[PDB]
Amino acid sequence: MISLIAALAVDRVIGMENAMPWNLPADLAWFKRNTLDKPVIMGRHTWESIGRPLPGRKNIILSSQPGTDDRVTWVKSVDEAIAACGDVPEIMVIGGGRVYEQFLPKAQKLYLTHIDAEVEGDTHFPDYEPDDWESVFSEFHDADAQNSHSYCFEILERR
């Protein structure tokens, strides 16, 4: 079972110059909650954006070229990435834009943080068909002293 987890600002913007331009500790806690003890698949740009291995998770990196870090697992295709996870209940695809586009047809669940932020970006979440997904979890939060935007955590399941 493949799931995508992503944080989306206005117009499905997810990144700008290898960074997520917002500071939402509540999204970091949600991300950790939902990915811990699950293999994580990421694109090479995301691996460089994060900057280090994610603890308590098997880290699988997609690249057409050989790996440059043995602390993580390197793969050269979507099918090889899935295979490297082994027999696990759930695989988490953590980005970026290009990796989400490829795993979206195979995904059964979307863990989305809808951020109320105006972000000029260079990376977007794929334009998912609303008719194909059903909202099973939806928890809205107002901004506070730690989180500068209002945000909604949503879980969508493929109909």
Ligand SMILES: NC(=O)C1=CN([C@@H]2O[C@H](COP(=O)(O)OP(=O)(O)OC[C@H]3O[C@@H](n4cnc5c(N)ncnc54)[C@H](OP(=O)(O)O)[C@@H]3O)[C@@H](O)[C@H]2O)C=CC1
């Ligand atoms: N808001 C959010 O939730 C998140 C946002 N982001 C943002 O997204 C951006 C990064 O996204 P993006 O630029 O799309 O890059 P990605 O992180 O999706 O990485 C793409 C790279 O991964 C490799 N790759 C992808 N698919 C394959 C494949 N099928 N086979 C082999 N290699 C593959 C390629 O590496 P190579 O070139 O080596 O072949 C490719 O250049 C950053 O701005 C980051 O901040 C990232 C995660 C989460």
Ligand SMILES: Nc1nc(N)c2ccccc2n1
């Ligand atoms: N919701 C969400 N999804 C991600 N894929 C992510 C990647 C790294 C750090 C914060 C993140 N938050």
Ligand SMILES: [Ca+2]
């Ligand atoms: Ca900033």
Ligand SMILES: [Ca+2]
């Ligand atoms: Ca490239």
Ligand SMILES: [Ca+2]
């Ligand atoms: Ca060795």
Ligand SMILES: [Ca+2]
């Ligand atoms: Ca881009």
Ligand SMILES: [Ca+2]
């Ligand atoms: Ca439509």
Ligand SMILES: [Ca+2]
């Ligand atoms: Ca803030």
Ligand SMILES: [Ca+2]
């Ligand atoms: Ca159904």
